[PDB]
Design an enzyme around this catalytic site. Sequence first.
Site, PDB file in Angstrom:
ATOM      1  N   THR I   1       0.859  -1.208   0.000  1.00  0.00           N
ATOM      2  CA  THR I   1       0.000   0.000   0.000  1.00  0.00           C
ATOM      3  C   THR I   1       0.885   1.244   0.000  1.00  0.00           C
ATOM      4  N   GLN I   2       0.712   2.124  -0.984  1.00  0.00           N
ATOM      5  CA  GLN I   2       1.454   3.407  -0.973  1.00  0.00           C
ATOM      6  C   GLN I   2       0.638   4.383  -0.128  1.00  0.00           C
ATOM      7  N   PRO I 105       4.898  -1.793  -0.042  1.00  0.00           N
ATOM      8  CA  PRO I 105       4.882  -2.213   1.360  1.00  0.00           C
ATOM      9  C   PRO I 105       3.541  -2.631   1.968  1.00  0.00           C
ATOM     10  CG  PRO I 105       4.742   0.180   1.182  1.00  0.00           C
ATOM     11  CD  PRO I 105       4.954  -0.342  -0.221  1.00  0.00           C
TER      12      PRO I 105
END
Lengths: 233, 239, 202, 212, 232, 233, 200, 196, 212
Positions: I1-2, I105
């Site tokens: 997830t950004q 991530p």
Amino acid sequence: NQYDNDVTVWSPQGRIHQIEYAMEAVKQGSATVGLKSKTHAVLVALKRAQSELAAHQKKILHVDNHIGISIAGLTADARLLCNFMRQECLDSRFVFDRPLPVSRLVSLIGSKTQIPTQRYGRRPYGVGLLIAGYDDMGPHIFQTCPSANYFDCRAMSIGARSQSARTYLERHMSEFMECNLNELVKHGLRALRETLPAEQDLTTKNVSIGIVGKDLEFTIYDDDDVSPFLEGL
Amino acid sequence: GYDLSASTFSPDGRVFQVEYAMKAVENSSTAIGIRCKDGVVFGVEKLVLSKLYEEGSNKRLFNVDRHVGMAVAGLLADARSLADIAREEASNFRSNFGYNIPLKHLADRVAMYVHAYTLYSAVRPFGCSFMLGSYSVNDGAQLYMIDPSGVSYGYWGCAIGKARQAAKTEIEKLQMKEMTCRDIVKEVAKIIYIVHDEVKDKAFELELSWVGELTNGRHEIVPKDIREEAEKYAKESLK
Amino acid sequence: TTIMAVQFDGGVVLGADSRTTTGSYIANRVTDKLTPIHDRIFCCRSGSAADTQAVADAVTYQLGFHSIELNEPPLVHTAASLFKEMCYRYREDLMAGIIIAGWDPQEGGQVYSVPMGGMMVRQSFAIGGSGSSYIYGYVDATYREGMTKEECLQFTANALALAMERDGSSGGVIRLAAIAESGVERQVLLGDQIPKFAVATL
Amino acid sequence: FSPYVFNGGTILAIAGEDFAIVASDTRLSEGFSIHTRDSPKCYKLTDKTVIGCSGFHGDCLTLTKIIEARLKMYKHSNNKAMTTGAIAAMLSTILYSRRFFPYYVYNIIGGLDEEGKGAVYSFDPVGSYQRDSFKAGGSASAMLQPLLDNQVGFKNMQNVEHVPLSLDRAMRLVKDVFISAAERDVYTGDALRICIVTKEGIREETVSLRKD
Amino acid sequence: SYDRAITVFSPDGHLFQVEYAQEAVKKGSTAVGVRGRDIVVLGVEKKSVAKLQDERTVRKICALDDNVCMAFAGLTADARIVINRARVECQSHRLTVEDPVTVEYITRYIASLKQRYTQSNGRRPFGISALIVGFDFDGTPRLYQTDPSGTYHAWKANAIGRGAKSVREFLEKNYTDEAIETDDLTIKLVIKALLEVVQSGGKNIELAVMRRDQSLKILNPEEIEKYVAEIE
Amino acid sequence: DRGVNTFSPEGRLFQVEYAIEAIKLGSTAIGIQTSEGVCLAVEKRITSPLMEPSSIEKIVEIDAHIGCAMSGLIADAKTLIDKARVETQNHWFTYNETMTVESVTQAVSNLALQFGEEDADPGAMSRPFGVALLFGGVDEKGPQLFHMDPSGTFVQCDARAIGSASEGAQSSLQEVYHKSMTLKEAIKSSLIILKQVMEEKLNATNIELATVQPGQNFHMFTKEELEEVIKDI
Amino acid sequence: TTTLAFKFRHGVIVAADSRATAGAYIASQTVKKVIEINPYLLGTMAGGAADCSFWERLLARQCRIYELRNKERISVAAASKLLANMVYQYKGMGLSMGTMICGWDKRGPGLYYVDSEGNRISGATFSVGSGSVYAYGVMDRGYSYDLEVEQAYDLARRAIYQATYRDAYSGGAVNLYHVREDGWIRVSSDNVADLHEKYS
Amino acid sequence: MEYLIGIQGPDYVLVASDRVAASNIVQMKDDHDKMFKMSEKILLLCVGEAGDTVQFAEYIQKNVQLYKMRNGYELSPTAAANFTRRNLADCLRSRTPYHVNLLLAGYDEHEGPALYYMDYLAALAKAPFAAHGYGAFLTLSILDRYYTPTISRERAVELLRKCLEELQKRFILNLPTFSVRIIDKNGIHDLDNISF
Amino acid sequence: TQNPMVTGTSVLGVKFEGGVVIAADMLGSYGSLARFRNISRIMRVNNSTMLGASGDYADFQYLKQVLGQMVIDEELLGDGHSYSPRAIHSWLTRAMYSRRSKMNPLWNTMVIGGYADGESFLGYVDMLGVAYEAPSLATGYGAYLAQPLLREVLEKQPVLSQTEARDLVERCMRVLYYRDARSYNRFQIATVTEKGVEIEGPLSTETNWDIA
Ligand SMILES: CC(C)C[C@@H](C=O)NC(=O)[C@H](CC(C)C)NC(=O)[C@H](CC(C)C)NC(=O)OCc1ccccc1
Ligand SMILES: CC(C)C[C@@H](C=O)NC(=O)[C@H](CC(C)C)NC(=O)[C@H](CC(C)C)NC(=O)OCc1ccccc1
């Protein structure tokens, strides 16, 4: 006749002759013995010299601190499987930081050795292996076959004239569990000897010993290190 | 030469490579499976070739999922391969749909992978037949058998191996629909002992597993105590 | 957008506004945000129209094949899980807030909120969209356990009306749907049918 | 999202005629917070080689497990344990393999050479290594290096006998330099892991520093 | 991709596909190469003159580079493929090393390719043998031979193709410091060697010479006739 | 009919057994390991006077401390000697150390048996390598000589003869080899046994000899030095 | 960094400093910035420490494989082109390497300069680094092809010393190498501190 | 920057190039050659980014030389100019573009002398005279004021001198020496370097 | 997830004599909005290991399915071996680092608490692959509000009982409710011991005092 040149052709009697042929290769290798006590698993290998001026060959190998292998059959195929086993053990200690259970490694080898037995143009593995390892389940001795089938063994002998050894092991197997390492190693050496050309003896040059236990990482005793074990027979 | 590839029909409409593959399953010891009202009990006659073999070597009863168990016959290497396929199909179903796979769906999906090995010359038909059994409150007990051809059917009592026919006569003398797993385990042991031929097949270890309301929908190996009572009943019945 | 779903003992009531918007323009003033994924499983779509229409179409296809293969009516959890799988996998390429509510023969009427990001949660009642914020205190103050299909239909209509009057991106007609073992009953509230609340004077 | 974070840490290695000391502070941190006060940055690689790694803790964990596997792979193919110089060279190749996404780690390999004498090698975050007699790395490197240069290298000192370094004199220097670093570096000061490598094995001693 | 093993060992340890390739080379025209002191000479038998055939298109002597040139016996189509690979290689070498390829460097590459086609799936060995002749930068005249097996050796003089044994027997008894002192004597040695196999004489014999620091020269039919008469 | 990877009823692999027969047709090469170093000798087997004897390279250098004697299909060896040279330089670049002779022999012996036609790879080998190799070198273990065959099997040999007259030079080798033998005595013993097996009359141009000694690097004896030893022979 | 090289009548003279720097921190004063590819070929390093050391070592590996396969030692030109082609594959990616390939080949003394930017130029006199500007002046004002061996040694030491006096990122000792037809010889390692006393 | 000039005459093509290679503020070479012999009657003068000029120029040279070896005859100046343009234009929208400005000059025994100007975008134009570099701005007008289609090779060298003297007086970069070569029926001829 | 979406707040951990205890609030917030207020951010990986997670809840839901299958896969073999609390921690560090290196991530800080072989395990794993073991753990704002208090008590009394550990966790949960604006007054306490992992239902710090 036309049912014995490919591994993808069942015989009219439900048999793949190519796997039966690959299994003959192991019976055409120097005898290797393997037994386990309650705490130790020992691999005794009868090294064979090509000539009077040639080293035997190296039949016992290291896979990980808790696992070691004795070889019978094509040494090249044995090295190829040994590398797969070494990497699978490295991968386990890198991801879970734990030694790979010995039973689980044997499952992976049987899966890798079965694929080549059902695909056109591929040959069965021609190596029989006696695996010795220690784990949270104690000492373990396993035997792998070119057919991709594996067996948890209390003691086993793979190679030429290995039935003579398996006869000794079956007779004395009852006392192996409660045995000291030297008593256990000498039992194995006696069986490997039962597989020797009548007029021949177990010298320090023709014998190798691999051992693993609760406090011992797999060790390959060769040359003079086998003298302690041989002295007493 | 019409019998050297699975990509070839005989001048009669038969693929003999798949018939030869199933000859391998008929040369294996028998594995019987009986469905009751409480769940399913699997039993296998595991012949022990070498006395230098630890107990439990070459096991022929597998746990393909928490609720599913697999009995096998024929080549153990091929059978272990199909257990991996069944274990992977169940895992992906739970990751995609989010629930325990129905045994019919697991059977259908594994049977299709088996049938895919009966059409090409690049691969040989699997030399193993297996029985998948499960028990859920919504679906109940289910027993399915898959053959080297890839045919899957549900049964109340199946028998694969060298003594399938004799085992079937014995299984057909039972009222499984009204019996319970606790009572079936002794009957499975009785049949495996009655079908075993000691004169030829040397010795064997009775392997017993079950899934049911008693195991709370979980495949497991019959408790040693229950297995021992069953074997005592089995031997006594043979008398 | 205001999407809302509530469960009752026997089924679920779903509701939505009917406004599509490009900036402050109403491209569609009569949109159907209540889409049927199966016979008794519907979805309430919020967020991007193209993203929500593509995922709902994909899940209907996958759910249809699954139901014909597994000869059994689909479970509401399975539809929610397939929606979660795509919305989590493409969370960075998909703006889609969905409520999967429907009736299944095994678990009854179930309302599942698969919000933006790919998360999935079962809820007694679910709300979503830009108008969801203005009716959080209302739904928390007016919701009572043991409500009926009729009471649940009024809760959805009253709540959507308040949100449609405060959210500019919400408005039009109130589309309602009641799903139960019997079937799916759909209803559109328009004009004076839409619940009204008196304004102040000071 | 940022893939790196400074976790703090000071490492030091000193070589002698028959010994090599690898020492480290034991405090992992993030921002103005302490993760743990017992995170030694020293790792035994062989019976004659210890590595000290400081920087991004995520990379130090990965690099240390990569080396442990690379050492086992060497022993399996070469039937021998890698020498301190061999690990120094391999680490340079491992670190450069990630030149476009580098390991935020500062490593100091300290061990005994094939001649049985101390050997210290220092590495940059990308691979450049050097055989040094003493090197300090990490958060308080510039606070510890200028003194080892004077007390061990006898630099800027005239009319002074250049006596050889005893393990006794070397260990007092290691403790003293780290005590001073604990005084002026906010990222150092829980305890001091000291690993001393000799032909008799690797002994590990832990002193205590100032908790903030 | 077709990946069958065309070249496989046979009982007795014989790769028959490679042996069949050498049978094709034996059916090829005779090519003779004599390495002199300041001149390397390559001569090929023009089997049939054809009369209605442009000779510029059926030349069996080619130049891989400014310093190297080769003659071949066996399949002309396989040769064109090998010559083009070696020509491209010589240029790639000049680009990565900035120097002319050595005669043995290109002989090694041509042999290594001719070898990989004998141990690669889906390929048949090349049915051609070559005579790579050139001058190393040191100025040493060089003569090498390649076999369909990928084997290569340096020679003072050799013969490939039909009647190679007869011609090589002749060169074995007629090669000496005497028959190599003069560039003309070197040329007439190749001419006499081919005339042992060539029946027409002069009319059916192509010949080429590469003196030091000079391009390959294709002797004109009249010049060849001059030597053929002097050699009579 | 049978593909490259088919086992015999005796489980041996036909392509690997026909490649061994291919070696029996090669020029005899003798290798002797002494404390003072390892000597590698080979028979050039020149075919015509017009051939340049120097172009026949049967003893090659893998590295300053490792040399190799080949017998069988020489062209097949080229790829194997290239792997050995690159593996040695890769070991230097990665560990800054000389590779052991056993590690070089193991790296090359691994390329053998890596053949097949079942889409094994885009550039997969089609058949086994019809060559036998005698690697001689000096590692941290001292002068070492290993022998590799087309089966992928490598062995440490004190004295070994490969080629057409191996079944005769090996008998002569086992009658003249003593662990205390000097390098000079070994060099003379190699030439004497070679002169016997060689069909042509041994001279300083029809044989190739090279030696790896503890301090000195791989050295191919020149005609002058060869002539001296051949004078005593 | 200060590395200079000049070709004269008695061979090619290669000299360099020993300082490595992280920011303004003097990490090392004993770095070897001259790599020996072979006993007859040596390469100097300026710019990124890890970058230069890795590629110059990969050059040494490729040069040795050349000797084994070609049975001849590589030229200074072929070695220069190999490194140039190896680095051009990574142009516009960050590699910072200024190098000089110096050796004795069949064409005589050889000096080539290769940058990670793509520049590959042969020459008689080159200086690479941040102190290159300071070294060029002393080297240029005192250079002569007919310089005697000892004078050439003194010119190189003095030019590196003057570069270390004006350059903050240049310092340590002066490492002098002389490439002759029989290979190279390491002439000396004089500390700029001792040189400061003599040259003053 | 670097300077390239070409003047096409009735039977010849005169080309000149600067001989300086600079690092940043220092000339590291004053005997550099920016002219490449593609054939016996074709020259490529290339200037541009470091590494891109020789990588593109040596590539075009080895491919033109492969043509002569593969076909027994050489590519014409026009065929060579077009082959170069296709390769420079086919790497423009690629991830590995070559920043190079070139001047191909050659003599075909049939079409006669030819000078071709090409920019980094790969636009090919045949020109009577052309120049590349910042010095072209101060010299192209001198060529336009004095170039006549029937200029002799002697008067061509004189105009080349007028242009290089202008660079010495008005240009801010020390370009002291120039490599001067001419191409004709008899091939490529090196002429004395015009130094200042 | 950004870009994290619905997230969870601090998760606490403390090892006592006989096992470990983890505590987390039952709330998932959508940027300041308490949107989902009856979610469990605690999980029973196996009978010896429990897992609490902070950060993206969909990323935690992904880990619960992957680790859940990993345990089912092992328990189908019947080999007698199981993933230990430390092995689960090693896998999670390898997973978080693998994702961080790919630049994708899993926005989650996990606390892994376990009990095996009479040893208590408490490990921390962040989204960048930073992981360590410690007597107490506090992710999020508990790192600044709860860990200080837990560390003070665990310094004087190094070994705590189950009664003491639970009391201190409930005290740290109250301070997190008073000063964390993303906290909630409903929480779950999970305890791993020789009996296995037990999770307690909705507990309340309702023992809050408001003398204003
Ligand atoms: C999911 C549907 C029910 C749509 C629903 C949202 O909840 N209602 C809406 O009003 C949403 C608002 C959204 C941006 C938050 N509208 C939309 O998403 C609009 C709908 C298009 C058909 C114009 N989409 C959009 O703005 O980009 C698509 C587009 C492309 C070209 C021109 C104009 C618009
Ligand atoms: C070959 C180099 C040492 C030449 C020198 C400058 O040209 N390089 C340097 O000075 C480099 C980069 C600098 C320009 C900022 N400085 C450095 O500090 C670099 C790496 C850091 C930038 C992380 N190298 C380094 O620290 O260690 C190099 C080294 C190598 C061998 C022994 C001792 C030290």
